[PDB]
Amino acid sequence: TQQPIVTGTSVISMKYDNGVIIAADNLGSYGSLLRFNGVERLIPVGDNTVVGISGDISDMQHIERLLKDLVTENAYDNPLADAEEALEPSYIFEYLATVMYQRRSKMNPLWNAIIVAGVQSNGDQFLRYVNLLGVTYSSPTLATGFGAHMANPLLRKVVDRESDIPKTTVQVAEEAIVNAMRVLYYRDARSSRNFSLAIIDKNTGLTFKKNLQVENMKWDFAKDIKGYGTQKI
């Protein structure tokens, strides 16, 4: 049993016709203090998987090292390490899900919420969630923390069920993710403007975008708002 110290906020994601998108801001908060402004919380594993992590950053860095060590270990005595025996999203997830549930069962959890986004060998979209309790679930849209409350409603308007996935292009899906990140910047007190976004496509592969910024922000209406009720100046 511990308490999280340095923390990362929402990770958001969705499936589209040919793949998956995942995104997360670049902040490490120390309670209310916005302490570390350059923290990468999307961690790629090979060229077919991105693991997005929220919660405790020390435990994130531990998980990052486990995944790095997992790639090394898979390559050992494996002539097909960059081909038919490469790491799949489903393998990487199940490993993490095992660890998360084991750690909660020893009453010493890894204080995180994790989304594994990727594309499988057969082209199938992979998107699954796991957290500090070992609770797992999949859905066309997934989000952690504030993202669950705010991003999912917006992303579900694009992909409301399984049958909406083939009808959703990468442009529409990315647009929805970028809008969701702006909404979270308006409304989450432990979020930041700077974020990273990753697209894993079955045709074009892994596209990792760094140093994105929330833009086209509406603040102009603020000038007219005066007082808290009766004040006119």
Binding site: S29, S32, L33, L34, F146, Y186, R187, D188, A189, R190, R193, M217, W219, D220, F221, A222, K223, I225, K226, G227, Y228, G229, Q231, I233
Partner: protein, 196 residues
Amino acid sequence: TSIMAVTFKDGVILGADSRTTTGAYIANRVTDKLTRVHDKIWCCRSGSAADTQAIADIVQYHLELYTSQYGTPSTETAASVFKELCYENKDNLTAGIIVAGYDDKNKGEVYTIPLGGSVHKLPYAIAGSGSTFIYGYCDKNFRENMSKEETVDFIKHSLSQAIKWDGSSGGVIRMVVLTAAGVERLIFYPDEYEQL
């Protein structure tokens, strides 16, 4: 919350961010924390929103009734009414108020009233959760008898840093200028102050 009031040559300027939070959710991102108790006596509010609004509404009532009977009240008088309410109800209030006002006799004055209900007259004052991060900055950069443009920059730069480090602070930087000339409202958006 990040709030400050700064005296300068021509009078006084109040400054505040616009963020209100319920835990980590931003309940209101465009809040007006600069609130009028009299024509040229304003206050910056921090602590419980319910408590500071309730106090500010009572003070506005007291000064309106003061004005009907005795003419324009001094800034010292306004600070004293704030103090009386804060001190006597200290067990039931979470209110940290900065009172700022312009007389022609006294010019610009700033009074800070922290949690206890004590009063402190100061050249400038900073308060709210985000103030902790700018004590160092404000002490080094404050000068007495600054110009209007210098004092606007001093507040803009100060609250910009407070906003940057405090999650509880953010949004627009509102300011209210109090001089002989009158009352001027200023607003500064993220795209302006973030790049400072």
